[PDB]
Design a protein around this nucleic acid. Structure first.
Lengths: 46, 56, 110, 120
RNA sequence: GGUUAAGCGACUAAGCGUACACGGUGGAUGCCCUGGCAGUCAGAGGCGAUGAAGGACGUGCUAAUCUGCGAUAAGCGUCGG
RNA sequence: CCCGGCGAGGGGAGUGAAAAAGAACCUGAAACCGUGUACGUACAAGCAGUGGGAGCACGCUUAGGCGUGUGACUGCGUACC
RNA sequence: AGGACCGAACCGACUAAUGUCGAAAAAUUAGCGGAUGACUUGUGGCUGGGGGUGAAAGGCCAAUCAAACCGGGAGAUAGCU
RNA sequence: CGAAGGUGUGCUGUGAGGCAUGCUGGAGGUAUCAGAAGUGCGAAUGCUGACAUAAGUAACGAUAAAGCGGGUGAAAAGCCCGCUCGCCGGAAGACCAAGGGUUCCUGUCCAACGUUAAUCGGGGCAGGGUGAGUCGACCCCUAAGGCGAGGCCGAAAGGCGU
RNA sequence: GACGACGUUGAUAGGCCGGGUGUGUAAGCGCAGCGAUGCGUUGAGCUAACCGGUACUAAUGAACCGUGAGGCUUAACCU
């Protein structure tokens, strides 16, 4: 079947990327919670 | 297809009363080579009733 | 004098090695080598490779006598498991456990 | 229910079955010995013994007859050209089956098929 | 002593049951600490455009990862212990 | 050092207080799984125990008979929450 | 010329089978409807939970939809097991 | 010259228990009398770890297909070569974008992985290989569209936009 | 799995010669036809399991489990 995750890096980057999530203040809290919860991989990097 | 009440290890044993491997004790000795093969078979060195039959 | 040889973690199950190592209970060695050379199985690859290692432990460490040398006890006992995961249908898995077994061969002259 | 039938199926379709027994009988006379399982040994016999039967009384037409059933003239070259005086007197069987033993691959009853007259 | 009949009659155990002796798998119990929680007591109560918190990639005798450090890279100078 | 496939695994030897402390390593219970010895068992049915009990097998005392194991057969008896 | 005809690709899902602890959390073989249109496909964007979007089935919104999912109120509450 | 714990055993109390002791064990335990609670488990289709059962049953993943000889090797229906046989051929062929990121190749190995064995493998150990003024991007130019200096507008964030 | 037939004192299987059966005028030559093809050879040839024979090959000497005159008591017959 046409399964749901038909992936890319172009869909991925402009949605869940760094400068996307660290654009707005509501995004920024996720970057300031993934920090404080001590996650290694912040959002997506290659 | 299902079990409703598990059989004990007793009846599990008596089902295994007949699985026992048949013994193949009936070896033979060669006529004129003296070695031992299995009956109606050939040896490792190609003998069968005192003949180099396969020469392998 | 008495001697023991063990193959530990033989990659099979207990009933698979129990069946051929039931015949060689209470036998002499040369009739046991001859009943295991022509038993068409995998455990007869297993323990016959080890039962000859037991008589080596006689001719070298214990009693060099092999002609009139008995096998007293032989008992295959269980071992660990390799719990892999098998996929069954409709999304649900299946905890397979690849079985493993231990075998002792005990050789002496009672 | 098999009652008075013959010719074991050997778990292949008839088209596959016939085409194997060609390329074993082609293989049989070229190397003079084959290892097979017991039934194929027991039923390559019922197939090959026509060939050296229909090759003692040599003709022009029987060349194609052992080419319609073989389609391998190199095997037909060994027939009729050595096998003639090799088998003048054997009114009947030409295979001495040997029960070799057991296949260490998959526990098959292995065996040995040969032509009787062997000196090499 | 022998003979026919009549009555009665164990040891056989493919396996299975129970108890002991023997391990086999298993990793519970007792014991252990450079691990962590709750607080007492002072001190601090900030880091940040003479570039942060948190990361990437490099650095050694080195393959790798952790600690430290940053083309001066497990370290430099400097005044002391 | 022997045997093995210059494998795995294992038996000796040597260290060590001990290798039934060996890298799956302190201690190592139970379920489950086998080995051996002893007894019962293939005309008997049924919550599988309890009351009675022959024979056999053993540790013993003291030789009169207890203890432990099994337990033919028999009287009752339909698990727990 | 055709929202024209026949029929592969592409697409769709009608009928039966099989499968339904599936080879698969919706498929495979045998056919079936269309196939220059109101079509089909790729890539890149926009719309948002009482809100999106809908040739309208309450269908679809990451296998879940008469109000998605994560965290937070919150150890909700439960005359009920 | 042997703590707790474990495992049997003889005694003891009306019971919850206690006391002595054989083996295993190898460094801690605790009387009498009192104090405080994470203080006693069979259940809750409770949680977690482990092990049975069904059972050595079912199944081995398209009904394109094998068969033979030789060799390597400890062992070969499956690995390497040769010989035929059979299957695909607007593909089950050969290139590219997406997307995966050493999966390619030689030496070497079989514990584990490969629904089997395995000398073989897209598996582990080790080393090697990707070479562009023209190929694609990066780069110069815009669409849909997202931000958005001044600004307009809005409790605050922020929304729209030149 | 059993039951049955044989194991060189052999017809139990396969082969083989023959017959039987089934399909129809094999192939290869020569003739007639420019050719497809028709005629002669030729009711030929080929023939699964069928039936009757022939040991040509395969069904070996052993090895193996199974023993070594069969308990007690009474009656009736042996002397």
């Amino acid at each position: 079947m046409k399964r749901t995750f038909q992936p890319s890096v172009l869909k991925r980057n402009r949605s869940h990327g760094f400068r996307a999530r660290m654009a707005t203040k509501n995004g920024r809290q996720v970057l300031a919670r993934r920090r404080a919860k001590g996650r290694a991989r912040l959002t997506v990097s290659k | 297809a299902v079990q409703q009440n598990k059989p004990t290890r007793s009846k599990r044993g008596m089902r295994r009363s007949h699985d026992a491997l048949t013994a193949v004790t009936s070896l033979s000795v060669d006529k004129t080579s003296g070695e031992k093969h299995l009956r109606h078979h050939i040896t490792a060195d190609g003998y069968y009733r005192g003949r180099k039959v396969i020469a392998k | 004098m008495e001697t023991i040889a063990k193959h530990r973690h033989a990659r099979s199950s207990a009933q698979k090695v129990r069946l051929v190592a039931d015949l060689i209970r209470g036998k002499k060695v040369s009739q046991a080598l001859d009943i295991l050379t022509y038993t068409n199985k995998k455990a007869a690859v297993l323990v016959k490779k080890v039962l000859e290692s037991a008589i080596a432990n006689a001719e070298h460490n214990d009693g060099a006598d092999i002609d009139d040398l008995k096998v007293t006890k032989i008992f295959v006992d269980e071992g660990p498991s390799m719990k892999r995961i098998m996929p069954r249908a409709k999304g649900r898995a299946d905890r397979i456990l690849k079985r493993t077994s231990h075998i002792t061969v005990v050789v002496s002259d009672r | 229910m098999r009652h008075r039938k013959s010719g074991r199926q050997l778990n292949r379709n008839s088209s596959h079955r016939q085409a194997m027994f060609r390329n074993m009988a082609g293989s049989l006379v070229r190397h003079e010995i084959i290892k097979t399982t017991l039934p194929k040994a027991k039923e390559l016999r019922r197939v090959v013994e026509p060939l050296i039967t229909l090759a003692k009384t040599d003709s022009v037409a029987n060349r194609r007859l052992a080419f319609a059933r073989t389609r391998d003239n190199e095997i037909v070259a060994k027939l009729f050209n050595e096998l003639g005086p090799r088998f003048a007197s054997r009114a009947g069987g030409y295979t001495r089956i040997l029960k070799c033993g057991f296949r260490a691959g998959d526990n098959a009853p292995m065996a040995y098929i040969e032509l009787v007259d062997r000196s090499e």
